[PDB]
Amino acid sequence: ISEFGITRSLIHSFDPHGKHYRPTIKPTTGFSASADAERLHRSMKGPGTNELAIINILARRTNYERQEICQSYKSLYKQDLKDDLKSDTSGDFRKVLCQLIVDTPYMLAKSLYYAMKGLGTNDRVLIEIFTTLWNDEMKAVADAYKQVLKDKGSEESERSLVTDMKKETCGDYEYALLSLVQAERDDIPILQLKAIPDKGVNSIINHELAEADAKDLYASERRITRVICNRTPYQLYLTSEIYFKMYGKTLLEHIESETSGDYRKLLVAVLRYAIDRPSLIAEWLHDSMAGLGTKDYALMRLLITRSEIDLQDIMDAYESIYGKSLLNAVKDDTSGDYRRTLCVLMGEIYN
């Protein structure tokens, strides 16, 4: 099973105008957990390893499918897939595989953990991860966090994700983070979400609310935090439009001149997640590759997660923004089976 369910929340699956985002990985038809499990086990037989075999499976499956496979191979072999892969591979390739065979929420929880363990605080990572989680997902990550602490020899009974953040963070930025982590953003019931393709988004937004919020903001303090962080992407988009109609300045522009530092970065990320997502995440990717190695984790984490949501859309944005395919940028920044893996997540298959 997966603490994230068969899919990521549907709330991530539609652009502002209600159109479906395009992923690079969809649920497999005929998906056989056992079949893939057997195929993986086979591929580790012998003194060496069939990297490509392994890649063509794991990087062509969803988190849920991957998890089913883990669960399958664990009973079909009384062995631990995570362990068997770790001992059959190494270097950058092993890293990516570990990121891949871990249930998404635990994956994120670990990176949150490393973002805060250490001197200083990797705000960029907190902003990047938290921006992309909705209430239920946020809760599963917080649970998984507790497990990471246990997993890393923490005898501290009461230590929690919020515990770590509070100590780690302060000011407007802290408040805004805690809000997201509090997991109390406006919800849209699964039924309403599912019906978006049919009834549109007019169905799940509110012009009265959007107007009030716009007027509220222009008068700008938890006011901006409340609107930007709580409103659904769909609600936020509408609020953005109304705000420009009413004031002739965009909500983005407004947020930028009115806020500073990490607080600003967070707000802008949350807003853009709603109204300019493809470009937002494209830039994040670009930034994970800027200079050298190494923001390897951000790169893996983004490709792995976004692949089952909107990676294709992000890819198109990337090429149109930077003049080069995401594929090529990735190819130029990485190598080995690690590179191959990233390419397959993007949809490029080999052998």
Provide the 8-state DSSP code for 42. Answer: H
Residues 279-318 that bind Ca ion (CB under 5 A): 289, 292-293
Cβ contacts of 191 within 8 Å, gap of 6 or more: none
Residues 209-238 that bind a second copy (CB under 8 A): 221, 224
Alpha-carbon span 127 to 116, nearest angstrom: 12
Taking the complex as a whole, how short is the minimal distance between the CB of residue 126 and a second copy, in angstroms? 9
Alpha-carbon span 292 to 332, nearest angstrom: 10
The binder of 224, among Ca ion, a second copy, none, by C-beta within 5 to 8 A per type, is: a second copy
Alpha-carbon span 214 to 205, nearest angstrom: 14
Q: Which stretch binds a second copy (CB under 8 A): 104-112, 231-239, 258-266, 324-332?
A: 258-266
Cβ contacts of 303 within 8 Å, gap of 6 or more: 285, 311, 330, 342, 345, 346
The binder of 184, among Ca ion, a second copy, none, by C-beta within 5 to 8 A per type, is: none
Q: How far is CA 327 from CA 316, 335, 346, in A?
A: 11, 12, 7
Taking the complex as a whole, how short is the minimal distance between the CB of residue 237 and a second copy, in angstroms? 22
The binder of 263, among a second copy, Ca ion, none, by C-beta within 5 to 8 A per type, is: a second copy
The binder of 14, among Ca ion, a second copy, none, by C-beta within 5 to 8 A per type, is: none
Residues 112-141 that bind a second copy (CB under 8 A): 115, 118-124
Taking the complex as a whole, how short is the minimal distance between the CB of residue 266 and a second copy, in angstroms? 9
44 annotated ligand-binding residue:
yes
Chain breaks in the chain (C to N over 2.5 A) after: 220
Taking the complex as a whole, how short is the minimal distance between the CB of residue 213 and a second copy, in angstroms? 16
Q: How far is CA 307 from CA 7, 199, 270, 303, in A?
A: 12, 26, 20, 6
The binder of 133, among a second copy, Ca ion, none, by C-beta within 5 to 8 A per type, is: none
CA angle 59, 61, 66 (to 5 degrees): 100
A 10 A CB-CB count for 252 gives 17
347 annotated ligand-binding residue:
no
Q: How far is CA 53 from CA 25, 329, 342, in A?
A: 17, 24, 14
Q: Which stretch binds a second copy (CB under 8 A): 144-152, 198-206, 259-267, 333-341?
A: 259-267
Rg of the chain on CA atoms, in Å: 21
Query: Maximum distance among all alpha carbons in the chain?
Result: 69
Look-up of token digits 């990550």? 141
Tell me, residue by residue from 7 to 46, as one string, x for binding to Ca ion by CB under 5 A and - for no binding. -------------------------------------x--
The binder of 333, among a second copy, Ca ion, none, by C-beta within 5 to 8 A per type, is: Ca ion
Does 286 help bind a second copy (rule: CB under 8 A)?
no
Query: Contact with a second copy (CB under 8 A): which of 203, 260, 320, 335?
Result: 260
166 annotated ligand-binding residue:
yes
Alpha-carbon span 116 to 215, nearest angstrom: 37
Tell me, residue by residue from 161 to 200, as one string, x for binding to a second copy by CB under 8 A and - for no binding. ------xxxxxxxx--------------------------
Please report the sign of the dihedral spanned by the C-alpha atoms of residue 314, residue 316, residue 16, residue 191: negative
Provide the 8-state DSSP code for 204. Answer: G
Query: Contact with Ca ion (CB under 5 A): which of 261, 324, 336, 349?
Result: 261
Which one, 191 or 292, has the nearer CB to Ca ion?
Answer: 292
Please tell me whether residue 274 adopts helix, strand or coil conformation. helix
Does 263 help bind a second copy (rule: CB under 8 A)?
yes
The residues of the shown chain that bind Ca ion, judged by CB under 5 A, are: 44, 48-49, 88, 123, 166, 170, 174, 261-262, 289, 292-293, 333-334
The residues of the shown chain that bind a second copy, judged by CB under 8 A, are: 115, 118-124, 167-174, 221, 224, 258-264
